[PDB]
JSON list of C-alpha atoms in Angstrom, two decimals:
[
{"chain": "A", "resi": 1, "resn": "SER", "atom": "CA", "xyz": [-136.31, 10.78, -170.44]},
{"chain": "A", "resi": 2, "resn": "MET", "atom": "CA", "xyz": [-139.16, 12.96, -170.90]},
{"chain": "A", "resi": 3, "resn": "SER", "atom": "CA", "xyz": [-139.14, 15.38, -173.32]},
{"chain": "A", "resi": 4, "resn": "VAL", "atom": "CA", "xyz": [-134.94, 14.00, -174.10]},
{"chain": "A", "resi": 5, "resn": "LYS", "atom": "CA", "xyz": [-135.00, 11.17, -177.17]},
{"chain": "A", "resi": 6, "resn": "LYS", "atom": "CA", "xyz": [-132.58, 9.46, -178.24]},
{"chain": "A", "resi": 7, "resn": "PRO", "atom": "CA", "xyz": [-131.73, 9.66, -181.87]},
{"chain": "A", "resi": 8, "resn": "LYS", "atom": "CA", "xyz": [-134.26, 8.28, -184.59]},
{"chain": "A", "resi": 9, "resn": "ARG", "atom": "CA", "xyz": [-133.07, 5.17, -186.18]},
{"chain": "A", "resi": 10, "resn": "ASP", "atom": "CA", "xyz": [-135.14, 5.08, -189.62]},
{"chain": "A", "resi": 11, "resn": "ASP", "atom": "CA", "xyz": [-137.24, 1.36, -188.72]},
{"chain": "A", "resi": 12, "resn": "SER", "atom": "CA", "xyz": [-139.37, 2.23, -192.11]},
{"chain": "A", "resi": 13, "resn": "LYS", "atom": "CA", "xyz": [-137.80, -0.53, -194.14]},
{"chain": "A", "resi": 14, "resn": "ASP", "atom": "CA", "xyz": [-137.74, -3.46, -190.90]},
{"chain": "A", "resi": 15, "resn": "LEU", "atom": "CA", "xyz": [-141.15, -5.17, -191.98]},
{"chain": "A", "resi": 16, "resn": "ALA", "atom": "CA", "xyz": [-140.06, -5.50, -196.09]},
{"chain": "A", "resi": 17, "resn": "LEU", "atom": "CA", "xyz": [-136.30, -6.62, -194.44]},
{"chain": "A", "resi": 18, "resn": "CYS", "atom": "CA", "xyz": [-137.87, -9.22, -192.00]},
{"chain": "A", "resi": 19, "resn": "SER", "atom": "CA", "xyz": [-139.86, -10.39, -195.16]},
{"chain": "A", "resi": 20, "resn": "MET", "atom": "CA", "xyz": [-136.61, -10.89, -197.04]},
{"chain": "A", "resi": 21, "resn": "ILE", "atom": "CA", "xyz": [-135.23, -13.23, -194.64]},
{"chain": "A", "resi": 22, "resn": "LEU", "atom": "CA", "xyz": [-137.90, -15.15, -193.09]},
{"chain": "A", "resi": 23, "resn": "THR", "atom": "CA", "xyz": [-138.16, -15.26, -197.67]},
{"chain": "A", "resi": 24, "resn": "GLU", "atom": "CA", "xyz": [-134.93, -16.96, -197.55]},
{"chain": "A", "resi": 25, "resn": "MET", "atom": "CA", "xyz": [-135.32, -19.16, -194.16]},
{"chain": "A", "resi": 26, "resn": "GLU", "atom": "CA", "xyz": [-138.62, -21.14, -196.13]},
{"chain": "A", "resi": 27, "resn": "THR", "atom": "CA", "xyz": [-136.58, -21.50, -198.93]},
{"chain": "A", "resi": 28, "resn": "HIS", "atom": "CA", "xyz": [-133.22, -23.55, -197.55]},
{"chain": "A", "resi": 29, "resn": "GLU", "atom": "CA", "xyz": [-133.54, -26.76, -198.36]},
{"chain": "A", "resi": 30, "resn": "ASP", "atom": "CA", "xyz": [-132.75, -28.10, -194.26]},
{"chain": "A", "resi": 31, "resn": "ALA", "atom": "CA", "xyz": [-136.45, -25.36, -193.63]},
{"chain": "A", "resi": 32, "resn": "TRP", "atom": "CA", "xyz": [-138.81, -28.76, -193.98]},
{"chain": "A", "resi": 33, "resn": "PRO", "atom": "CA", "xyz": [-139.18, -29.35, -189.97]},
{"chain": "A", "resi": 34, "resn": "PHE", "atom": "CA", "xyz": [-139.68, -25.96, -189.66]},
{"chain": "A", "resi": 35, "resn": "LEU", "atom": "CA", "xyz": [-141.94, -24.90, -192.23]},
{"chain": "A", "resi": 36, "resn": "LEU", "atom": "CA", "xyz": [-145.83, -25.76, -190.33]},
{"chain": "A", "resi": 37, "resn": "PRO", "atom": "CA", "xyz": [-146.60, -26.64, -187.08]},
{"chain": "A", "resi": 38, "resn": "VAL", "atom": "CA", "xyz": [-145.90, -29.98, -185.14]},
{"chain": "A", "resi": 39, "resn": "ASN", "atom": "CA", "xyz": [-148.86, -31.38, -185.36]},
{"chain": "A", "resi": 40, "resn": "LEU", "atom": "CA", "xyz": [-149.05, -32.00, -181.31]},
{"chain": "A", "resi": 41, "resn": "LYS", "atom": "CA", "xyz": [-152.43, -34.94, -182.13]},
{"chain": "A", "resi": 42, "resn": "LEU", "atom": "CA", "xyz": [-149.39, -37.33, -183.93]},
{"chain": "A", "resi": 43, "resn": "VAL", "atom": "CA", "xyz": [-146.07, -36.31, -182.32]},
{"chain": "A", "resi": 44, "resn": "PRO", "atom": "CA", "xyz": [-145.87, -37.64, -178.62]},
{"chain": "A", "resi": 45, "resn": "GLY", "atom": "CA", "xyz": [-143.81, -34.99, -176.08]},
{"chain": "A", "resi": 46, "resn": "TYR", "atom": "CA", "xyz": [-144.86, -32.24, -178.50]},
{"chain": "A", "resi": 47, "resn": "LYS", "atom": "CA", "xyz": [-147.44, -30.44, -176.37]},
{"chain": "A", "resi": 48, "resn": "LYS", "atom": "CA", "xyz": [-146.56, -31.21, -172.41]},
{"chain": "A", "resi": 49, "resn": "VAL", "atom": "CA", "xyz": [-143.22, -30.00, -173.28]},
{"chain": "A", "resi": 50, "resn": "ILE", "atom": "CA", "xyz": [-143.20, -27.27, -175.38]},
{"chain": "A", "resi": 51, "resn": "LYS", "atom": "CA", "xyz": [-144.35, -24.42, -173.97]},
{"chain": "A", "resi": 52, "resn": "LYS", "atom": "CA", "xyz": [-144.26, -22.45, -176.84]},
{"chain": "A", "resi": 53, "resn": "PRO", "atom": "CA", "xyz": [-145.06, -23.91, -180.14]},
{"chain": "A", "resi": 54, "resn": "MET", "atom": "CA", "xyz": [-143.27, -21.64, -183.25]},
{"chain": "A", "resi": 55, "resn": "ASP", "atom": "CA", "xyz": [-142.92, -22.11, -187.21]},
{"chain": "A", "resi": 56, "resn": "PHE", "atom": "CA", "xyz": [-142.18, -20.23, -190.03]},
{"chain": "A", "resi": 57, "resn": "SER", "atom": "CA", "xyz": [-145.53, -20.06, -191.38]},
{"chain": "A", "resi": 58, "resn": "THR", "atom": "CA", "xyz": [-147.04, -18.91, -187.94]},
{"chain": "A", "resi": 59, "resn": "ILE", "atom": "CA", "xyz": [-144.06, -15.87, -188.27]},
{"chain": "A", "resi": 60, "resn": "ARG", "atom": "CA", "xyz": [-145.08, -15.63, -192.02]},
{"chain": "A", "resi": 61, "resn": "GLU", "atom": "CA", "xyz": [-148.69, -14.78, -190.70]},
{"chain": "A", "resi": 62, "resn": "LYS", "atom": "CA", "xyz": [-148.00, -12.80, -187.98]},
{"chain": "A", "resi": 63, "resn": "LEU", "atom": "CA", "xyz": [-145.81, -10.87, -190.20]},
{"chain": "A", "resi": 64, "resn": "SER", "atom": "CA", "xyz": [-148.11, -10.16, -192.77]},
{"chain": "A", "resi": 65, "resn": "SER", "atom": "CA", "xyz": [-151.16, -9.34, -190.20]},
{"chain": "A", "resi": 66, "resn": "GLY", "atom": "CA", "xyz": [-149.38, -6.83, -188.26]},
{"chain": "A", "resi": 67, "resn": "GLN", "atom": "CA", "xyz": [-148.33, -8.71, -185.28]},
{"chain": "A", "resi": 68, "resn": "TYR", "atom": "CA", "xyz": [-145.06, -7.58, -184.79]},
{"chain": "A", "resi": 69, "resn": "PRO", "atom": "CA", "xyz": [-144.40, -4.25, -183.21]},
{"chain": "A", "resi": 70, "resn": "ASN", "atom": "CA", "xyz": [-140.42, -4.17, -183.88]},
{"chain": "A", "resi": 71, "resn": "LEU", "atom": "CA", "xyz": [-137.42, -6.77, -185.42]},
{"chain": "A", "resi": 72, "resn": "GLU", "atom": "CA", "xyz": [-136.67, -7.34, -182.09]},
{"chain": "A", "resi": 73, "resn": "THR", "atom": "CA", "xyz": [-140.23, -9.77, -181.14]},
{"chain": "A", "resi": 74, "resn": "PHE", "atom": "CA", "xyz": [-139.60, -10.93, -184.97]},
{"chain": "A", "resi": 75, "resn": "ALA", "atom": "CA", "xyz": [-136.51, -12.63, -184.37]},
{"chain": "A", "resi": 76, "resn": "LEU", "atom": "CA", "xyz": [-137.87, -13.35, -180.62]},
{"chain": "A", "resi": 77, "resn": "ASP", "atom": "CA", "xyz": [-140.22, -15.86, -182.56]},
{"chain": "A", "resi": 78, "resn": "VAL", "atom": "CA", "xyz": [-137.26, -17.14, -185.50]},
{"chain": "A", "resi": 79, "resn": "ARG", "atom": "CA", "xyz": [-135.03, -18.01, -182.21]},
{"chain": "A", "resi": 80, "resn": "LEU", "atom": "CA", "xyz": [-137.71, -20.01, -180.44]},
{"chain": "A", "resi": 81, "resn": "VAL", "atom": "CA", "xyz": [-138.22, -21.79, -183.75]},
{"chain": "A", "resi": 82, "resn": "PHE", "atom": "CA", "xyz": [-134.57, -22.95, -183.04]},
{"chain": "A", "resi": 83, "resn": "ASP", "atom": "CA", "xyz": [-134.80, -23.13, -179.14]},
{"chain": "A", "resi": 84, "resn": "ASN", "atom": "CA", "xyz": [-138.14, -25.66, -179.12]},
{"chain": "A", "resi": 85, "resn": "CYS", "atom": "CA", "xyz": [-135.91, -27.82, -181.74]},
{"chain": "A", "resi": 86, "resn": "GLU", "atom": "CA", "xyz": [-133.17, -27.76, -179.76]},
{"chain": "A", "resi": 87, "resn": "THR", "atom": "CA", "xyz": [-135.49, -29.25, -176.44]},
{"chain": "A", "resi": 88, "resn": "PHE", "atom": "CA", "xyz": [-137.36, -31.73, -178.43]},
{"chain": "A", "resi": 89, "resn": "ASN", "atom": "CA", "xyz": [-133.86, -33.28, -180.86]},
{"chain": "A", "resi": 90, "resn": "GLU", "atom": "CA", "xyz": [-130.70, -35.23, -179.66]},
{"chain": "A", "resi": 91, "resn": "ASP", "atom": "CA", "xyz": [-127.93, -32.78, -181.93]},
{"chain": "A", "resi": 92, "resn": "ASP", "atom": "CA", "xyz": [-126.79, -36.03, -183.18]},
{"chain": "A", "resi": 93, "resn": "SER", "atom": "CA", "xyz": [-130.05, -36.30, -185.27]},
{"chain": "A", "resi": 94, "resn": "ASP", "atom": "CA", "xyz": [-130.98, -34.83, -189.10]},
{"chain": "A", "resi": 95, "resn": "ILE", "atom": "CA", "xyz": [-133.50, -32.61, -186.84]},
{"chain": "A", "resi": 96, "resn": "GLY", "atom": "CA", "xyz": [-131.35, -31.27, -184.55]},
{"chain": "A", "resi": 97, "resn": "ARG", "atom": "CA", "xyz": [-128.86, -30.51, -187.03]},
{"chain": "A", "resi": 98, "resn": "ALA", "atom": "CA", "xyz": [-131.33, -28.38, -189.28]},
{"chain": "A", "resi": 99, "resn": "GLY", "atom": "CA", "xyz": [-132.33, -26.45, -186.19]},
{"chain": "A", "resi": 100, "resn": "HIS", "atom": "CA", "xyz": [-128.62, -25.54, -185.93]},
{"chain": "A", "resi": 101, "resn": "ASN", "atom": "CA", "xyz": [-127.82, -24.95, -189.34]},
{"chain": "A", "resi": 102, "resn": "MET", "atom": "CA", "xyz": [-130.60, -22.54, -189.81]},
{"chain": "A", "resi": 103, "resn": "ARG", "atom": "CA", "xyz": [-130.06, -20.62, -186.76]},
{"chain": "A", "resi": 104, "resn": "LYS", "atom": "CA", "xyz": [-126.78, -19.97, -187.82]},
{"chain": "A", "resi": 105, "resn": "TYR", "atom": "CA", "xyz": [-127.85, -19.13, -191.52]},
{"chain": "A", "resi": 106, "resn": "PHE", "atom": "CA", "xyz": [-130.11, -16.65, -189.30]},
{"chain": "A", "resi": 107, "resn": "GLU", "atom": "CA", "xyz": [-128.26, -15.47, -187.08]},
{"chain": "A", "resi": 108, "resn": "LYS", "atom": "CA", "xyz": [-125.70, -13.93, -190.32]},
{"chain": "A", "resi": 109, "resn": "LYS", "atom": "CA", "xyz": [-128.29, -12.40, -192.38]},
{"chain": "A", "resi": 110, "resn": "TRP", "atom": "CA", "xyz": [-129.44, -11.06, -189.26]},
{"chain": "A", "resi": 111, "resn": "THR", "atom": "CA", "xyz": [-125.72, -9.32, -188.59]},
{"chain": "A", "resi": 112, "resn": "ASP", "atom": "CA", "xyz": [-125.41, -8.66, -192.22]},
{"chain": "A", "resi": 113, "resn": "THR", "atom": "CA", "xyz": [-128.57, -6.78, -192.57]},
{"chain": "A", "resi": 114, "resn": "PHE", "atom": "CA", "xyz": [-129.44, -5.05, -189.02]},
{"chain": "A", "resi": 115, "resn": "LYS", "atom": "CA", "xyz": [-125.87, -4.66, -187.06]}
]
């Protein structure tokens, strides 16, 4: 509260670290469904169903241009990619499986880096 601060968690490496994690996700072999925005002119349903599209390239631009106020807002966008994937794809499709794998991959790097 006012003039009563919790000790300062060092956040000064967060930007570099989230960039590294993102690089690792960008280069995973199962990243392919997630690298670019879903083409909303060519994928029926996507526009109306998925209220908040997200993809790795958009996260990379946001990160590069100071659009994440902190590491949690970054983790929210990453998870949103996989949540959208689960909403639109059957678990037993190549894309649905890619999404599960990528989430698992992300969450391990996140825990190992920050927790």
